[PDB]
Write a protein that binds this ligand. Structure first.
Ligand SMILES: O=C(O)[C@@H]1C[C@H]2C[C@@H](Oc3cccc(Cl)c3-c3nnn[nH]3)CC[C@H]2CN1
Ligand SMILES: O=C(O)[C@@H]1C[C@H]2C[C@@H](Oc3cccc(Cl)c3-c3nnn[nH]3)CC[C@H]2CN1
Lengths: 258, 258
């Protein structure tokens, strides 16, 4: 008992949160998808008693604004009441929190470093004080913005290096970034959850140091939605039951690295 | 801008969040206190424009239910509308969220291990595998409850160890637990924020492994308070500005180790 009607869930394809399910025969509706977020959605529907319809965000975007303030992506779907929930790795940010509501986080993470295994680099500071190893982030991504705006000595220094080499230092997309780490002596600054995913599948790669910032993913709802607080309670129940840990293990685990 | 009235803030003495100021001259009102949470209040009032009056919770408790299902501590002060905000390291929990509201976390942490430096022990699994090194937690503490309830094989084994060896493994209080780590061959399971604090000030001690669970501290409010969402937004602003990082450094950092 949450509402007498199917809830519309906006989402986006992103491994391993929301993925297209491999099948030998055609699949329909929600059955077409799988992943951490689909498991979270099933768990939330079990606890809260709702039926749902998963719809990919038409423009394939998470949510940002133009200079006139027009939002796009999942955030816009919620603002316009075209979706009841957004279940995706959607970062809880100051700007978004002003236009939509978020449950409390289901996952906490931060910016960290993706690099090769067995080198003497152990931190952002180590990278900052040298020039032989290149480093950067996805151009105009969440990680790039963090460095551009930072007033922290080491991060301001890193940004100076990342913006001297517009082209060599920054990457066009995340695919290019991972390819660059694998093919050149390059360290990629990126979301720690994605680092964990990649390092479980590439034994030659490792995370360097800890978290550079702190952020979390939350279920998005339109502003004022009564479902927001019920989803927060369900997330807390899942955490205390150990189910958030089991869901992360399920999707993140690789078959092993020596 | 936020409220016409001076907000009543319930809090509790807990180093380095809320402490009594050491002065040689009498201190009055809010000037009697200092700490991470007093700095957080200053920053939140600077953003939101409210005035506040800090009051230590009479019973000196965070908030739990007794046998009659009656709440105590800061939680009870909020329930009864004797406080507008609770600004303290108050864990966001499923039970509390049922009776009060919380801002999104201003600090994330988890259970971890405090032990002596330079040993071969590197994780909970290393401790679980043996019996020579005793390990445990504060009796009926948050940390003990986690182990008692866990379905994770490693932690279920650790609970079996703790419950069977209760007289030595389970400690009466935090002080007793820290003395055990210092005087005996004992590892203490406890909140990671408190481990960081202790290890910055005692070079003989270290944190073992990473985080065993995930939890956050939030600003508590009575259910329905309009200040809750404003607080959440101010917390997001402070993190993005790097002020939460600066505040954590200010109060946690020690003078170093060899
Ligand atoms: O709310 C948001 O905008 C993001 C959208 C989305 C962004 C995804 O970004 C990556 C995804 C995979 C691999 C990498 Cl290498 C990155 C990355 N990008 N910037 N820094 N690292 C991370 C997961 C999601 C987290 N919420
Ligand atoms: O909302 C709550 O009830 C708690 C209450 C309070 C608990 C404090 O816990 C410790 C603090 C310092 C040292 C230690 Cl050793 C402990 C601890 N860890 N496990 N058992 N005891 C941490 C601060 C607050 C965290 N929120």
């Amino acid at each position: 008992s949450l509402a007498n009607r199917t809830l519309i869930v906006t989402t986006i394809l992103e491994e391993p949160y929301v993925m297209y399910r491999k099948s030998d025969k055609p699949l329909y509706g929600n059955d077409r998808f799988e992943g951490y977020c689909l498991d979270l959605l099933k768990e939330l529907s079990n606890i809260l008693g709702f039926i749902y319809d998963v719809k990919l965000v038409p423009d394939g975007k998470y949510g940002a604004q133009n200079d006139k303030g027009e939002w796009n992506g999942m955030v816009k779907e919620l603002i316009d009441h075209r979706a009841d929930l957004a279940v995706a790795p959607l970062t809880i940010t100051y700007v978004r929190e002003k236009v939509i509501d978020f449950s409390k986080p289901f996952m906490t993470l931060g910016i960290s470093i993706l690099y090769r295994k067995g080198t003497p680099i152990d931190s952002a500071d180590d990278l900052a004080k040298q020039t032989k190893i290149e480093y950067g982030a996805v151009r105009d991504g969440s990680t790039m913005t963090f460095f551009k705006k930072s007033k922290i000595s080491t991060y301001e220094k890193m940004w100076a290096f990342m913006s001297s080499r517009q082209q060599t230092a920054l990457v066009r997309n995340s695919d290019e970034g991972i390819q660059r780490v694998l093919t050149t002596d390059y360290a990629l600054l990126m979301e720690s959850t994605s680092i964990e995913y990649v390092t479980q599948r590439n034994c030659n790669l490792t995370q360097i140091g800890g978290l550079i910032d702190s952020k979390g993913y939350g279920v998005g709802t339109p502003i004022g939605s009564p479902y927001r607080d019920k989803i927060t309670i369900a997330i807390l129940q899942l955490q205390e039951e150990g189910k958030l840990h089991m869901m992360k293990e399920k999707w993140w685990r690789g078959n092993g690295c020596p």
